[PDB]
From a paper:
Na+/H+ antiporters are found in all cells to help regulate intracellular pH, sodium levels, and cell volume. Bacterial NhaA is an electrogenic Na+/H+ antiporter that transports 2 H+ in exchange for 1 Na+ across the membrane. The NhaA-fold consists of a scaffold domain that mediates dimerization (dimer domain), and an ion-translocation (core) domain, which is typified by a six transmembrane (TM) bundle harbouring two opposite-facing discontinuous helices that crossover near the centre of the membrane. EcNhaA is inactive below pH 6.0, and between pH 6.5 and pH 8 transport rates increase 2000-fold.
Author numbering: 10 to 384
Amino acid sequence: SDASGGIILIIAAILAMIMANSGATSGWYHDFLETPVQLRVGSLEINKNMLLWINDALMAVFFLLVGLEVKRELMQGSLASLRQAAFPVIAAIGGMIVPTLLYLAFNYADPITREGWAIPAATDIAFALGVLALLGSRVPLALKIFLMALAIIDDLGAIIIIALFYTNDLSMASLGVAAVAIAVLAVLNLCGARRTGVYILVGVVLWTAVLKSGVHATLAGVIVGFFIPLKEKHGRSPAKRLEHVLHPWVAYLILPLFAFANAGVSLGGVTLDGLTSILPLGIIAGMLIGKPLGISLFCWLALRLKLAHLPEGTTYQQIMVVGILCGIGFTMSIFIASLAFGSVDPELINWAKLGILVGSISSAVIGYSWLRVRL
Ligand SMILES: CCCCCCCC/C=C/CCCCCCCC(=O)OC[C@H](O)CO
Ligand SMILES: CCCCCCCC/C=C\CCCCCCCC(=O)OC[C@H](O)CO
C-alpha cells in the first residue's frame, strides 16, 4: 500500500497544479478555496475559509491515525523502551534542530517569515515510505520502522511546539472544555472501555471545543488516537482494528484530497530570483541540507559515543539515505506552512509551497538515487 499510496498522492498533487494553472479551472479553484464559511448548529458559530475547513477535517482524521501509530510504537514498537527509542529519538532531534537552524539562518530577521521555522522540520510519511517501497524486498523492514518513527516524532514535535506557541488563540472556556474531555478519555481508558465509538464521540466534542485553533484541532485527533486502548484482550484490540480500517481511507482518500486542495500553485511570475528569496531558500536549505545533515550527524554521534545502537538489520549508510528521504516534507510541510502563514497573505503561502515543492521533489530524486546505490 506504500507505493500506490505515494503514487496516488503525486497524481493528486499534479492535478492540483493543473487546476491552479489552467485558464479553464484556475479561477474556480482559487475562488472556491477562499470562500468564507460559517456552519449553523445551535448557539455555536465559527467562521473560517473553505480551505481551512477542509484541512481541519482531513488533518483531524490523518492525525487520528498518527495517534494510533505513535501509541503503538510507544507500547509495542521501536519506542517501547530506552534501548530501542534512543536512536530514532536522537535522529529526530537532529532532524528538528538542523533544519530549523538553516531556515532561521535566512529568515530570523524577518518577523513574518520566521514564523515558518518548522516548515522544513516536517516529513511527508506517505511520500517518503512510497519512495522506500520502490526498492521492494531489498529494503529491511527495520529501515521502514526507523523512518516511520523518525518522521512521526518530528511531525508531532512540530505540531506540539506550534500548539504551545499558539495557546493564546484559545479561550479560557475552550481550554476548560478540552481539559474535561481529555480527562473523560483518560478515565474511559483506565477503567476499561473498549468500544471505539464512545472515544470518537468524546473526540468530536474535544475537536469542536478547540476548533478555532487549527493546530489544536489537529492535536485533538492525536489525543483520541492515543487513548483508544491497544491491549490485546482475547486477541483483539480496538486500536489495532481502527488503525487497520482507517489506513486505506487515509492513504487513498484523505491525503490525496489534502494534496489536491493544497499542492496547486500558480507558476506565472515565478522566477529564479524569486526561488532564491529568503523564504523558499530557507525551506529548500532546510530540506536538502538540514534534514540529511541533522539526522546523519546526530546518529553518527549517538553511535560514536555509545548513546544508541543501529536498529538490527540496518547499516549506517542506509540511515543516511533515510536522512535524505526525510527531506520530503511535501504535504506535512504544506500543512505546517498553512498553520504559520494561512491567515497572513497568499503571496507568502504560495512561495512557501513553491519552496516545499522544489525541496521535496529534489529530496525524492536524490534519496531514490542513493537508495538504488545502497540497496
Ligand atoms: C514537545 C516535545 C516533543 C514531543 C515529541 C512527540 C513525540 C513523543 C514520542 C517521542 C519520545 C519517545 C519516548 C520514549 C521513552 C522510552 C520508553 C520507555 O522506556 O518506557 C518503558 C515502558 O515499559 C514502555 O512500555
Ligand atoms: C514553547 C516552546 C517550548 C519548546 C520545548 C521543546 C523542547 C524540546 C527540545 C529538544 C528537541 C529540539 C527542539 C528544537 C525546536 C526548534 C527551536 C524552536 O522551537 O524555536 C524556533 C523559534 O520559534 C523560531 O522563531
